Amino acid sequence: MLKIIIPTTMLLPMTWMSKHNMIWINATVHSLLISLISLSLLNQLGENSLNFSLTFFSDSLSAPLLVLTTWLLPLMLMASQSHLSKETTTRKKLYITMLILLQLFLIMTFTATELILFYILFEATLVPTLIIITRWGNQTERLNAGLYFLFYTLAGSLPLLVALVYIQNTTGSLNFLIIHYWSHPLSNSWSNIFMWLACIMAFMVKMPLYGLHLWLPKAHVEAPIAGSMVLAAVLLKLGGYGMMRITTILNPLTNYMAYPFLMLSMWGMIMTSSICLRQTDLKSLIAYSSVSHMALVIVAIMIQTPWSFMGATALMIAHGLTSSMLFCLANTNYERVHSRTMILARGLQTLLPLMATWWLVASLTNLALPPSINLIGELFIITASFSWSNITIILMGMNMMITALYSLYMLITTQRGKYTHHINNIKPSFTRENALMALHILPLLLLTLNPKMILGPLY
Amino acid sequence: GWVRPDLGELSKVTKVKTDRPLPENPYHSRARPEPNPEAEGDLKPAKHGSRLFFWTM
Ligand SMILES: CCCCCCCCCCCCCCCCC[C@@H](O)O[C@H](CO[C@H](O)CCCCCCCCCCCCCCC)COP(=O)(O)OCC[N+](C)(C)C
Ligand SMILES: CCCCCCCC/C=C\CCCCCCCC(=O)O[C@H](COC(=O)CCCCCCC/C=C/CCCCCCCC)COP(=O)(O)OCCN
């Protein structure tokens, strides 16, 4: 696993010793090379895992997340090149350093074989994100946003640490392989109930679960574009990966401890979706759509069936790519208009046709049009939920309809109709933006050809 | 025919020849508790190192 970790670390001296005008070029080229190297992790077995050493191991659940993490960095660099033009060289290097440190922490977190190691890196991912949000954010709300993003997270994760050390004093190990092979049932007890809550709440708060999601709209609308990309595409999936890993020691308590969350998700996905129908901010709408998709992922993980896990993995990957693309499109509008209000810039299909095509493809993917992998994950989750209880279809069905509505709403308000008369500064789209959208959208349609790569270890 | 002892003579530490047996436990002490086992041997490296959380050394 060090063949990926060491070059990512070498990105830092390469960034700092680079010329003043060559930081973006070198960073982009070497990040793309690291992504190409990390592509080799996709060769997985139907057997246990790729146990490289005592410290790191890879799975068909970890491999797609690692590939997505390594692929997101060049896109973030391209997206950040524009609005950081008038910034001093040292601060640009600091920005790139924050992005590299985030990538390193994520890489290690996904492959860590120890629960405590996983916790440490899972928390280490907070500092770069907080600095990025509160330093290079634009509005004055960013400070408050950062505070929320911090304390919510910590409020969930401090109990987990306690539980973790408690577990290691009882079983004697926190290694995931030993934990899986030596699993024992959890008896119905108040102590076991609180241990379950401590092990679950930290991952619930970062999905985010409905009712614990208030930090996400603030953080995503106040972050810079690269921060929004990494928050929506990768940092949300940390909770899903953690819950997928930790549910092996929580049975059979999950059979009845999952009821409050399942409801909170199944109703919650409705509410957030309906919230998207009445929203005046593009980024806020995209963030709430992320909340709805992650509620579906929460349901999938709590159901605890093979089809549920396959659908959850596929949906996590698909949502990461789609939400990153949508945030990039919204930002490409914002850098022209400087408003972030949906109804200001209108009728943009007439002025920017290719960007309108990108908007259409992104909206179609978010709408879960078959055979996209978004729909593959959604349909597998829906089938598993139907087996769990035939009534669930109702709520699931409703969500589907609502989703389409707001997706097309966002497409119709910004792209169709008449152009705004007084807005005369809408320049032709640059090659950088078009390439960014193409590099977002081509991997999705390529992945629909080999879905087994993103279906997780239960395929 | 008595001769007065001189200076420094009555403060001498003398010796006494007695048939009284020497007491063996004048303090009436009980049996002293046995000491701790006092383990000893050759030092070997710790098995798998510190074994602290995720550290392999
Ligand atoms: C705010 C936004 C959302 C945040 C996330 C919310 C999710 C957290 C919800 C917690 C899950 C439920 C916790 C406990 C569930 C166990 C089942 C139990 O509560 O039901 C009955 C228990 O009866 C009563 O519930 C007893 C407890 C009553 C007092 C608890 C407070 C009730 C409402 C408090 C809600 C406050 C939540 C927010 C805190 C800040 C069952 O009867 P009994 O067979 O006897 O007990 C079985 C358990 N045994 C085997 C260990 C004995
Ligand atoms: C986003 C905000 C969320 C905040 C976190 C919510 C989760 C809270 C979970 C409980 C907190 C403490 C967890 C305990 C760590 C696990 C260790 C464990 O399970 O050991 C138990 C100990 O369990 C406890 O002691 C837990 C008691 C609770 C004390 C702290 C109360 C915290 C608040 C409780 C109510 C809120 C919980 C749900 C909140 C929902 C989200 C708001 C057994 O102890 P023993 O005595 O050794 O064994 C018994 C046989 N002799």
Annotate B15-50 with DSSP letters as a single string.
-----SPPPS-TT---PPPPPP----------TTTT
Buried b (16+ CB within 10 A) or exposed e, A299-337: bbbbbbbebbbbbbbbbbbbbbbbbbbbbbbbbbbbebe
Buried b (16+ CB within 10 A) or exposed e, A100-120: bbbbbbbbbbbbbbbbbbbbb
A290's CB contacts (< 8 A; 6+ apart) are A216, A220, A232, A236, A319, A323
Q: A352 and A283 in contact (C-beta within 8 Å)?
A: no
What's the token pair of residue A413?
């308000």
CA distances, A376 to each of A69, A368, A448 (Å): 21, 8, 9
- Provide the phi-psi class of A411: left if phi over 0, else alpha when psi is between -120 and 50, else beta: alpha
| CA dist., res. A118 & res. B13, Å (int) | 81
Q: A318 and A300 in contact (C-beta within 8 Å)?
A: no
Q: CA A151: distance to chain centroid?
A: 19
**What 3 state SS string does A93-157 have?**
HHHHHHHHHHHHHHHHHHHECEHHHHHHHHHHCHHHHHHHHHHHCCCCCHHHHHHHHHHHHHHHH
| CA dist., res. A86 & res. A312, Å (int) | 42
Name all residues whose Cβ lies below 6 A of ligand 2: A 152, 155-156, 159, 162-163, 166, 191, 194-195, 197-198, 201, 205, 212
- DSSP-assigned beta bridge partners for residue A281: A341
What phi and psi, each to the nearest 5 degrees, are found at residue A94? -65, -40
Task: Determine the residue of A169, A186, A191 to mutate for testing ligand 2's pocket, defined as the one with the most ligand atoms within 8 A of the Cβ atom.
Answer: A191
What's the CA-to-centroid distance between A262 and ligand 2, angstroms?
Answer: 21
Amino acid identity of residue A45, one-letter, is L
Question: Residues of B with CB below 8 A from A168's CB?
Answer: 53
- DSSP-assigned beta bridge partners for residue A112: A56
| CA dist., res. A368 & res. A47, Å (int) | 32
| CA dist., res. A381 & res. A132, Å (int) | 34
Question: Residues of A with CB below 8 A from B53's CB?
Answer: 114, 116-117, 168, 174
Q: A312 and A240 in contact (C-beta within 8 Å)?
A: yes
Residue A381's CB is within 10 A of a number of other CB atoms, namely 27
| CA dist., res. A122 & res. A240, Å (int) | 12
Q: A321 and A328 in contact (C-beta within 8 Å)?
A: no
Range A33-40, long-range pairs (CB < 8 A, 24+ positions): A33/A7, A34/A4, A34/A7, A34/A8, A34/A70, A34/A73, A35/A67, A35/A70, A35/A71, A35/A73, A35/A74, A37/A3, A37/A4, A37/A7, A38/A4, A38/A66, A38/A67, A38/A70, A39/A67
- Provide the phi-psi class of A385: left if phi over 0, else alpha when psi is between -120 and 50, else beta: alpha
What's the token pair of residue A39?
């592509």
What phi and psi, each to the nearest 5 degrees, are found at residue A353? -70, -40
Resolution (A): 2.7
| CA dist., res. A333 & res. A114, Å (int) | 43
Torsion A435-A72-A290-A427 (CA) sign:
negative
Method: cryo-EM
Helices A282-303 and A215-222, packing angle to 10 deg: 140
A451's CB contacts (< 8 A; 6+ apart) are A314, A373, A376
Among all residues of chain B, which has the CA nearest to that of A54? Answer: B56
Q: In angstroms, what is the C-alpha Rg of chain B?
A: 32
